Design an enzyme around this catalytic site. Structure first.
Site, mmCIF file in Angstrom:
data_model
loop_
_atom_site.group_PDB
_atom_site.id
_atom_site.type_symbol
_atom_site.label_atom_id
_atom_site.label_comp_id
_atom_site.label_asym_id
_atom_site.label_seq_id
_atom_site.Cartn_x
_atom_site.Cartn_y
_atom_site.Cartn_z
ATOM 1 N N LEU C 38 0.838 -1.188 0.000
ATOM 2 C CA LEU C 38 0.000 0.000 0.000
ATOM 3 C C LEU C 38 0.877 1.244 0.000
ATOM 4 O O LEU C 38 2.084 1.184 0.247
ATOM 5 C CB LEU C 38 -0.960 0.034 1.203
ATOM 6 N N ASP C 39 0.247 2.380 -0.279
ATOM 7 C CA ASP C 39 0.917 3.664 -0.393
ATOM 8 C C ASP C 39 0.670 4.501 0.859
ATOM 9 O O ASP C 39 -0.282 4.275 1.609
ATOM 10 C CB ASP C 39 0.421 4.404 -1.639
ATOM 11 N N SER C 40 1.556 5.480 1.079
ATOM 12 C CA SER C 40 1.324 6.477 2.121
ATOM 13 C C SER C 40 0.116 7.344 1.799
ATOM 14 O O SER C 40 -0.532 7.878 2.710
ATOM 15 C CB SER C 40 2.577 7.336 2.314
ATOM 16 N N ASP C 42 -2.526 5.889 0.515
ATOM 17 C CA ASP C 42 -3.567 5.029 1.062
ATOM 18 C C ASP C 42 -3.513 4.980 2.581
ATOM 19 O O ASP C 42 -4.546 4.761 3.223
ATOM 20 C CB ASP C 42 -3.433 3.632 0.473
ATOM 21 N N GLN C 43 -2.327 5.196 3.160
ATOM 22 C CA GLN C 43 -2.205 5.348 4.607
ATOM 23 C C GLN C 43 -3.039 6.516 5.110
ATOM 24 O O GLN C 43 -3.859 6.351 6.022
ATOM 25 C CB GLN C 43 -0.740 5.543 4.995
#
Ligand SMILES: NC(=O)C1=CN([C@@H]2O[C@H](COP(=O)(O)OP(=O)(O)OC[C@H]3O[C@@H](n4cnc5c(N)ncnc54)[C@H](OP(=O)(O)O)[C@@H]3O)[C@@H](O)[C@H]2O)C=CC1
Ligand SMILES: CCCCCCCCCCCCCC(=O)SCCNC(=O)CCNC(=O)[C@@H](O)C(C)(C)COP(=O)(O)O
Ligand code: SF4
Ligand code: SF4
Ligand code: SF4
Lengths: 287, 176, 80, 156, 114, 208
Positions: C38-40, C42-43
């Protein structure tokens, strides 16, 4: 072919594109959107009108400086029509009132109009003539509309055989007829399965087919993506719009697919659904 | 040197203060304004009947962008590109060629009527007075195609009249 | 009716309700950022999504310091 | 053919009724607005032609687009254009407005008001002299004299 | 070489301000797409927002990141007011083609675009 | 030499020369140039750190009042590493004189936002931020004023060309106005007017 018909550079706003299109109609709905997308392409459109110049005035500034041109036509003489199609790359035939008039029936517009224009076209030497038709216009009953369109279909198929006979389904959009009648209600409830196709995918398909050669001779039919019941669609219209004889018979008559002829997939255009554009167009309700 | 305003006081004398009270409670100088406006009512108004009476002008108006030509002669322009060199919206477009005779001439002499701000610089810049700002100002054109002059339109527009242009120049070739 | 396990169950089904996570695969040491791809982006989507779910504003540095499901649950258990 | 006779006479009456007064709205961005106010002046009249200058957009017969159209101006201009009754006519006044003009090669400027609204009557000039603008409104009236709407409706 | 940066010390504060700015853009989108009576699903608008964020992820210089944060804050202010109209908001989108792909042969038909 | 050529006063030249020498001596921390032209209008050329101290000095001190604030622009000069030139212009209500505070700056490092002492500099600084991109730290509100909102490029630079990259048109496809890459109708021709032959022998720069 001579120069200044070949394409030049990028597209849009008097970039010299390919086709020079003589359009019959274009004061109505689909022809107006088609002139719009050819103006985005940057194509010269020769359109004759018969009405007041105010209608062609409020659809005038679609093109760039002097691209589209306006002249006159009539449903009686070959001379004015031939003068309108003296020099044309492509020509499209879109015409028809959905009620009989004093001087015109459903007969002889759909019959007599493609006869004379196809006569002067085949004597003129035009190419990529695109003739519209309603979907499932048969020899069968219930519509002088549909049977005169079937006679016109047989005419355009027989004389000038390499015409693109094209047909969409019953299209919806900003100035739809049947969704307007859904708004202009009162009521009655029947059953009919039906697929609606949005107008911009239809006219994108028409401009892509008219600018892409080798796709000629074949009749085409456009497909709605949902294909469900009419009465569920009426419930959908009232739900999204917040409020609780010829046209109604011709929407209750026939809505089917035909496996014979090719449609959207041989053209490469994305289909817009009913739901997105219907939410976009269902304004003008209570607040 | 300065002459400023609004340096007084309301006079405390009884006559001046009761006159200001009379204007306050009696609506006087309002009716004085009504009297002045009725005096302009009883004048004769200064209008001109437009399609029959046309408003006055000068011999040096800048209008039509017409061309001139020699006495029983050929086109006055040489295509020396001075007007396109000075044209502050670059509306002049000159493409020049010589003909079969030998004197240098044109091919294409276009005025954009959209871009033309109507300075007069192409009139002042022309060494032979080929282009002349015309006398009449009635274009009123229903289509945008028709507002792009060609050299042949300019020659027809210079051959619809010269006698006006010649009269204006022959009156005022001494100032400029 | 506000315990640690009820908050963890509602965090669990809203992690089920998020679309791009494939599958849920809950753990106390999950670290859905790099161990789940996942991406930051998405974080911060998930952090302010929990903010949209059930309460307090969860500012920027505490949004950065989580990076992990059970650490989110424990940070809410600290803050709520 | 007294049906056609009544159609022609009634069309003459209604179109003369349209072209009779024709009160405009003065949009008027730049100095072309000052020249429009100078054909509002006591010399060049507008009372004589039934022409009442009026800032109301809701009742605008014709609309005189004048001044210099910009990119920041254009959506607000067409929003002014929309809340307007469908019998409507447009006079593009000014070299700036009828094709870009002196600011043709620029950014932030729409190349004439053709790219936003349709144009019935172009009147060029910088400024188009109030006399010439009044001539342009007369040729607008003659365009209203040739419209044949009821003829087309009867023989439609 | 003395250079005075805007806000930054390392890219940690850069990451912090850009994630808070993205949170502000997330809670900015639905109010505006409801206010301007727009015609686009919320998923598509948010995906184009995060696509515009993911376009300029290749910048490591912290002053440039600070100036990007300040520009995004400016346009978030000017869209959270009603100062920008429907035209500019649709102008962020591209629903009018613009169809031009990056194929070689497609640019070879409509030529002179290397 | 006397008719139709404007005469001058050396007295005002000596006054401005002595005054600029005085200011250069009493604020040595930031003074780099104090230049006086032929027609006696003062120019003071300043490092981009003494913006607030020099303007707080020049607003006051009863020897140079200069309350009146005017133009701000940062004349885009390439062939430099410090490209932009922030030009304060100051007018004295008490002394009737014009001084031009030219401070130099680069593309990305801010000068120190003169709105703290000059309430006229607010929309001036907002204009310079919109047209150039000279950032102004410690400023209340920086927005885009005198441009379109959705437009970007900082157009008064030299890198931005004459025509814009975008161009609007209405279309009935999506029933609204959209922007496209620019399709000019004509060239905007370019006249090579920079004639040779050295019209001013005094302003010759030394060649290599
Ligand atoms: N759902 C749908 O509506 C579908 C429609 N079609 C077909 O598409 C075509 C266009 O539809 P639409 O725009 O809705 O309808 P229109 O009536 O508006 O289009 C017909 C055009 O031709 C003109 N015209 C029609 N009859 C005459 C006549 N006797 N003399 C002169 N001009 C005439 C019309 O008016 P004017 O004279 O003022 O120019 C108009 O410009 C029709 O032929 C229709 O059958 C096909 C599939 C689905
Ligand atoms: C209608 C829709 C609404 C409009 C849609 C368009 C909106 C346009 C908004 C434009 C805003 C931007 O594009 S700014 C993008 C910033 N990009 C960056 O790379 C900034 C630097 N940051 C980074 O490199 C990293 O933080 C990463 C890689 C982006 C994220 O790392 P995480 O993992 O640690
Ligand atoms: S300045 Fe006169 S002679 Fe020269 S090119 Fe122009 S019109 Fe012709
Ligand atoms: S008057 Fe018109 S044609 Fe002549 S220089 Fe000026 S803009 Fe050009
Ligand atoms: S055409 Fe001339 S008078 Fe009219 S707005 Fe432009 S500059 Fe002003």
């Amino acid at each position: 072919l001579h120069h200044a018909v070949i394409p030049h550079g990028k597209g849009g706003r008097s970039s010299v594109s390919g086709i020079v299109a003589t359009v019959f109609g274009a004061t109505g709905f689909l022809g107006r959107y088609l002139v719009n997308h050819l103006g985005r392409m940057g194509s010269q459109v020769i359109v004759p009108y018969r009405c007041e110049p105010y209608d062609t005035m409020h659809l005038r500034p679609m093109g760039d400086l002097g691209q589209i041109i306006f002249m006159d036509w009539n449903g009686r003489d070959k001379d004015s029509i031939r003068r309108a199609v003296e020099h044309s790359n492509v020509v499209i035939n879109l015409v028809g009132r959905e009620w009989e008039t004093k001087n015109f029936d459903f007969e002889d517009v759909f019959v007599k109009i493609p006869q004379a224009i196809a006569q002067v076209s085949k004597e003129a030497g035009v190419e990529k003539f695109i003739h519209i038709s309603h979907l499932n216009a048969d020899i069968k009953s219930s519509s002088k509309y549909l049977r005169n369109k079937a006679v016109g279909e047989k005419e355009v198929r027989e004389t000038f055989p390499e015409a693109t006979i094209i047909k969409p389904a019953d299209i919806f959009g900003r100035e739809d007829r049947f969704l307007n009648y859904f708004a202009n209600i009162r009521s009655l409830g029947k059953k009919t399965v039906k697929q609606p196709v949005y107008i911009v995918d239809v006219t994108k398909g028409i401009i892509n087919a008219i600018k892409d050669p080798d796709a000629r001779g074949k009749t085409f039919a456009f497909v709605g993506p949902n294909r469900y019941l009419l009465f569920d669609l009426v419930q959908y219209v009232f739900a999204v719009a917040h409020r609780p004889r010829d046209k109604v018979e011709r929407i209750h008559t026939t809505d089917r697919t035909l496996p014979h002829l090719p449609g959207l997939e041989d053209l490469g255009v994305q289909a817009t659904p009913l739901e997105l554009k219907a939410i976009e167009v269902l304004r003008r309700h209570r607040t | 040197t300065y002459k400023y305003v609004n340096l007084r006081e309301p006079s405390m004398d009884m006559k001046s203060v009761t006159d200001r009270a009379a204007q306050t409670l009696l609506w006087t100088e309002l009716i004085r304004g009504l009297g002045m406006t009725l005096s302009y009512l009883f004048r004769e108004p200064a209008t001109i009947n437009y399609p029959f009476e046309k408003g006055p002008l000068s011999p040096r108006f800048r209008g039509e962008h017409a061309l001139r030509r020699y006495p029983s002669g050929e086109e006055r322009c040489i295509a020396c590109k001075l007007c396109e060199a000075v044209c502050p919206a670059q509306a002049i477009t000159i493409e020049a060629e010589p003909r079969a005779d030998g004197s240098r001439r044109t091919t294409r002499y276009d005025i954009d009527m959209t871009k033309c701000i109507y300075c007069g610089f192409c009139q002042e810049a022309c060494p032979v007075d080929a282009i002349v700002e015309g006398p009449n100002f009635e274009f009123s054109t229903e289509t945008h195609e028709e507002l792009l002059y060609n050299k042949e339109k300019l020659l027809n527009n210079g051959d619809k009249w010269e006698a006006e242009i010649a009269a204006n120049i022959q009156a005022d070739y001494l100032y400029r | 009716p506000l315990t640690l396990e009820g908050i963890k169950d509602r965090v669990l089904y809203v992690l089920k309700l998020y679309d791009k996570i494939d599958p849920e695969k809950l753990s106390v040491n999950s670290h859905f950022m790099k161990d789940l791809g996942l991406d930051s982006l998405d974080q911060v989507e998930i952090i302010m999504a929990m903010e949209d779910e059930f309460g307090f504003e969860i500012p920027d540095i505490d949004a950065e310091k989580l990076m992990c499901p059970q650490e989110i649950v424990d940070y809410i258990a600290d803050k709520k | 053919s007294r049906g056609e006779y009544v159609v022609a006479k009634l069309d003459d009456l209604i179109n003369w009724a349209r072209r009779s007064s024709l009160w405009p709205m003065t949009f008027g961005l730049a100095c072309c607005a000052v020249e429009m106010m100078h054909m509002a002046a006591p010399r060049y009249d507008m009372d004589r032609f039934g022409v009442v200058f009026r800032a109301s957009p809701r009742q605008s017969d014709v609309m005189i687009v004048a001044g210099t159209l910009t990119n920041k101006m254009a959506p607000a201009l067409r929003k002014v254009y929309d809340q307007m009754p469908e019998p409507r006519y447009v006079v593009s006044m000014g070299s700036c407005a009828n094709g870009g003009g002196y600011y043709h090669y620029s950014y932030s400027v729409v190349r004439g008001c053709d790219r936003i609204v349709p144009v019935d009557i172009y009147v060029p000039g910088c400024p188009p002299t109030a006399e010439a603008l009044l001539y342009g409104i007369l040729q607008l009236q003659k365009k209203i004299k040739r419209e044949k709407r009821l003829r087309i409706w009867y023989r439609r | 070489t003395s250079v005075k940066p805007i806000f930054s010390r390392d890219m940690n504060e850069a990451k912090r301000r850009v994630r808070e700015l993205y949170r502000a853009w997330y809670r900015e989108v639905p109010n505006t797409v409801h206010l301007f009576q727009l015609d686009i699903s919320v998923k598509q608008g948010r995906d184009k927002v995060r696509e515009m964020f993911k376009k300029n992820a290749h910048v490591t210089d912290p002053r440039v990141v600070d100036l990007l944060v300040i520009k995004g804050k400016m346009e978030l202010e000017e869209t959270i007011n009603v100062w920008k109209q429907r035209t500019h908001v649709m102008r962020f989108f591209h629903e009018t083609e613009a169809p031009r792909p990056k194929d070689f042969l497609s640019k070879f038909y409509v030529g002179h675009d290397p | 030499t006397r008719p139709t050529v404007r005469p001058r006063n050396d007295v005002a030249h000596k006054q401005l020369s002595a005054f600029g020498e005085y200011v250069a001596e009493i604020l040595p921390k930031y003074v780099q140039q104090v230049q006086v032209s032929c027609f006696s209008e003062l120019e003071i050329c300043i490092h981009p750190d003494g913006v607030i101290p020099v303007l707080t000095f020049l607003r006051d001190h009863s020897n140079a009042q200069f309350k009146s604030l005017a133009d701000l622009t940062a004349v885009d000069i390439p062939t430099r590493q410090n490209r932009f030139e922030i030009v304060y212009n100051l007018l004295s209500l008490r002394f009737n004189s014009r001084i031009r505070v030219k401070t130099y700056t680069d593309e990305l490092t801010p000068v120190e936002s003169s709105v703290s002492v000059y309430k006229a500099a607010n929309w001036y600084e907002r204009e310079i931020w919109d047209m150039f991109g000279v950032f102004f730290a410690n400023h209340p509100d920086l927005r885009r004023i005198l441009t379109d909102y959705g437009f970007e490029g900082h157009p008064f630079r030299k890198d931005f060309p004459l025509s814009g990259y975008v161009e609007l048109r209405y279309d009935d496809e999506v029933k609204r106005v959209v922007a496209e890459p620019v399709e000019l109708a004509q060239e905007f021709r370019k006249f090579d007017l920079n004639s040779p032959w050295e019209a001013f022998p005094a302003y010759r720069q030394p060649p290599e």
